[PDB]
Design a binder for these strands. Structure first.
Lengths: 106, 170, 134, 197, 69
RNA sequence: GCUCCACACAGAUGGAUACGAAUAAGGCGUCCUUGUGGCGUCGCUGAACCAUAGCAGGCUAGCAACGGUGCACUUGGCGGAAAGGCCUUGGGUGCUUGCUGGCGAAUUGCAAUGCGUGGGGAUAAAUCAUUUGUAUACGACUUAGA
RNA sequence: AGAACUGGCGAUGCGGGAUGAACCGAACGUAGAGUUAAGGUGCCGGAAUACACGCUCAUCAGACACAAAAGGUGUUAG
RNA sequence: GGAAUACUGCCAGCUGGGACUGAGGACUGCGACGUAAGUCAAGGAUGCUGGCAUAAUGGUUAUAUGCCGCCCGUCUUGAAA
């Protein structure tokens, strides 16, 4: 009743990039409550949805969602790589993202 | 992690000299290859035997007799640095010979800037009784009923923000 | 008449029971046998299960509990002294071990158990509020 | 974890605190820094004072105003320290800086809200014991800051009546604990204890 | 958590049962029968009916990789 | 700013959950000779506290409490650093899952979150006009006239 | 200053090095997945405010071989 | 006196979590299970389900933004200039 959340909120840090080159096809996502790669291993394969409000109404709603998946871990701070059907605008750096529990294995 | 190895060589015995002196020494190294290389270098330096006419009879690993017994180790070390080579003696209070030699190597690389390349372990021995230790910092731990605190412990934080103002009390 | 306040420190010494923070035996009690140096101390936890070894003080955290122990005691003597002192009974009674047990139990809770806990908490809160202001 | 984080800057390192605040800002986290004047910097006071002079001595000849700007307020100094750690002159950097606010003391309504500290940036946790350290407030006063007196005067009032609020909270928690104790040993309490609560 | 199901008939349902060629009367009757069969098992344990009725949602501080289900 | 007419509609979704001071020391309870006092008790992270059940959260009948909570009122207090918020007395109106029952969910078919402009009416003010210099190359500025 | 022999350049893109002609790896079809070199892991900058042993308060330290032979009641080891 | 553990190496040992690829196009061959009939993970993916005609989806312009990119042609000198 008070809360209807069924996802783990996260933050989009930036694309997989070198010192001077970036690869938008891969996005780095920070998951709250994750600190080590072992913890992030559970989130692999989970669907990632980015929810934002659009000025125009297209399908009877003002919310447009971009879907994605968790590919593999990144670094030692729990960062996990993610790939979406369409890459993020690159303006969402630090924006909130939603990670669902499906497809679940537990 | 260091390891203790025993290497023996007898310079490829030839006619009229069967079973030569069979030089024996103990070499500390992280693997068999490094132990063999250090043995060859020591033979070339101290002795007149080189790998051209040398032969490794057998290489074995020596395990400390009492890995759970505290000992005081006296080590004689000859090392080379920017200046001329000179002898050195140090005393280490450790549990095993491997740990003592590792600590000695770390100290040499820290204080004297001498690394494994130019360090020779002449001998490692155990000090049996007290009052034979000649280093004050080793005598420090030999005092009866030694008790001391650990002030200002560096507590580790798993989160960036902590609503506690942690105290370093121990 | 003299006053010396706030000078209670958990000294590291022989017979000082300690709790391992990191390593294979993390969360298992151990007893200091002999001090090697300012950074290395020999510990033995045969009752707990951790084998005798020399551990770094940075990987272990001291505890207030203490018990007599001869210097450089072997595993058998250490276990005998541990049993005689009954340090385990004191450890459980302390709020630190109780906190550890509570954290473990909470981590081991189930969804249905969580719902039961929620219902019981609601009932307890209702009872407390009824008691309050009276 | 929190829509806005209020960090108590008292007894904190300028470098580590600024770095962590900037990193959080780049992650889309709003942070407010308070008690900037109480910020501490490692090293003896003279070294910090000498360091400040050599960065303001570079005044541009043709246009000083359009050139380097020398700010004396401790909050301004902290912002300058954090500004260099962020990729400024860019939209991403400019947007991130908008999420940070620096104030001297604890002006309201932050005075009535919870504040946090950064363990990795604590001066008493990183600096070796017995080593010299510098205070940001004293350095700012030496280099030209003129509001230290008022800052201290109205910060003392901040502790005033907040001690009273804490006393009232302690009195309330006394009754709360009494109610919890008298409610203990009950069937519901026993079940909660068995279930880890 | 588990609830006894040996007392509930489920062999009738199959892939063709859910085919769609204003609720089918047969579907309602089957649902009523299943509910009648399973209500006793649900009531066999306290708070099980309330637990089932209550929805599931996440709260602050909840770590799915740490929670036990 | 007042009034009449024509037209459009960088990232919430549990709670930012309030002392100060020391860190070679500290809190909390209690006691007394009222002290830089005695005893107990706690940290070793927020893995914490409140709240979290109800067709995205309905209808309805009882039990026990008479407490908890939303709402506009109502008496009063505090908050000038960026007060703009914090409460507090009295009643009223709803929920209460604190406890025990009866009704609906389905077919959405295995998932694609599920509030000013532009045209008028009146009225406050400003620029130029005019004109004095205290300003003056031109800008600009100080003045006077219902 | 002028000659003799010898490895890169020149006809040459890529990563690293605040940028780079004498520095390291690597010498090239368009794409997907994965593993690495040099170079890096407090922010800008993708990666550990990792571990362990010691060292230094520097009033212009430190993280870049000539002036470096000696001086210091500065410190840690022989 | 006795076993256990650490380390090394092997397993033609067993079994979970995640990502991309579906290339070939009626059988000819190497192989396994099975007494046999027949089957198979054996020279490259098949079956089922959900969205759709005022569709699903896709294409162009600028701005919204993560990073990079010296002004083109000829000629000097081994180069840049």
């Amino acid at each position: 009743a008070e809360s209807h959340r069924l996802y783990v909120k996260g933050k989009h840090l930036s694309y997989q990039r070198s010192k001077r080159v970036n690869n938008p096809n891969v996005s780095l996502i920070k998951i709250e409550g994750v600190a080590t790669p072992q913890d992030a291993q559970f989130y692999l394969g989970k669907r990632i949805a980015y929810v934002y409000r659009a000025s125009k109404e297209v399908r009877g709603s003002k919310i447009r969602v971009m879907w994605g998946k968790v590919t593999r871990t990144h670094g030692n701070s729990g960062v996990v790589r993610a790939t979406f059907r369409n890459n993020l605008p690159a303006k969402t750096f630090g924006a909130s993202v939603r990670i669902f529990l499906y497809p679940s294995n537990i | 992690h260091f390891k203790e190895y025993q290497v023996i060589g007898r310079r490829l015995p030839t006619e009229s000299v069967p079973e030569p002196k069979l030089f024996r020494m103990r070499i500390f190294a992280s693997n068999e290859v490094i132990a063999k290389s250090r043995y060859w270098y020591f033979l070339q330096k101290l002795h007149k035997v080189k790998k051209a006419s040398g032969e490794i009879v057998s290489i074995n690993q020596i395990n400390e007799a009492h890995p759970t017994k505290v000992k005081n180790f006296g080590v004689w070390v000859r090392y080379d640095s920017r200046s001329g080579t000179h002898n050195m003696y140090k005393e280490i209070r450790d549990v095993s010979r491997v740990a003592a030699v590792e600590t000695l190597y770390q100290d040499m690389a820290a204080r004297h800037r001498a690394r494994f390349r130019s360090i020779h372990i002449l001998k490692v021995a155990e000090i049996e009784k007290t009052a034979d230790v000649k280093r004050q910092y080793v005598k420090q731990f030999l005092t009866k009923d030694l008790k001391f605190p650990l002030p200002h412990r560096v507590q580790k934080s798993t989160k960036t923000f902590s609503y506690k103002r942690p105290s370093t009390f121990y | 008449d003299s006053i010396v306040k706030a000078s209670n420190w958990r000294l590291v010494e022989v017979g000082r029971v300690v709790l391992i923070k990191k390593g294979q035996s993390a969360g298992k009690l151990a007893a200091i046998v002999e001090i090697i140096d300012q950074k290395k101390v020999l510990i033995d936890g045969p009752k707990a299960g951790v084998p005798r070894q020399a551990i770094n003080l940075g990987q272990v955290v001291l505890t207030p509990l203490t018990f007599a122990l001869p210097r450089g005691a072997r595993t058998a003597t250490v276990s005998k002294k541990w049993a005689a002192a009954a340090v385990c009974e004191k450890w459980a009674a302390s709020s630190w071990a109780k906190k550890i047990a509570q954290r473990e139990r909470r981590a081991a809770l189930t969804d249905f158990e969580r719902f039961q806990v929620m219902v019981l908490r609601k009932q307890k809160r209702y009872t407390v509020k009824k008691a309050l202001a009276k | 974890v929190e829509p806005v984080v209020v960090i108590d800057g008292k007894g904190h390192l300028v470098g580590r605190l600024a770095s962590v605040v900037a990193k959080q800002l780049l992650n889309g986290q709003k942070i407010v820094v308070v008690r900037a004047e109480e910020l501490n910097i490692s090293g003896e006071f003279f070294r910090n004072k000498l360091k400040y002079h050599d960065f303001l001595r570079k005044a541009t000849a043709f246009n000083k105003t359009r050139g380097p700007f020398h700010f004396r307020a401790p909050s301004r100094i902290f912002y300058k320290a954090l500004r260099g750690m962020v990729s400024h002159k860019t939209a991403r950097g400019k947007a991130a800086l908008e999420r940070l606010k620096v104030f001297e003391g604890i002006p309201p309504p932050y005075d009535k809200k919870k504040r946090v500290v950064v363990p990795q940036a604590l001066r008493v946790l990183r600096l070796k014991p017995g080593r010299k350290y510098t205070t940001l407030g004293k350095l700012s006063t030496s280099v030209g800051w003129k509001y230290e007196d008022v800052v201290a005067k109205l910060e003392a009032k901040r502790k005033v009546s907040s001690a009273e609020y804490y006393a009232k909270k302690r009195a309330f928690t006394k009754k709360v604990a009494s109610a919890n104790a008298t409610a203990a040993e009950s069937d519901v309490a026993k079940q909660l204890a068995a279930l880890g609560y | 958590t588990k609830v006894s199901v040996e007392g509930v008939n489920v062999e009738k349902f199959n892939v063709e049962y859910f085919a769609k060629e204003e609720i089918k009367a047969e579907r309602v009757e089957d649902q009523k029968v299943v509910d009648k069969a399973l209500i006793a098992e649900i009531k066999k344990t306290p708070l099980l009916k309330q637990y089932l009725s209550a929805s599931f949602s996440l709260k602050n501080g909840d770590k799915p990789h740490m929670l036990k289900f």
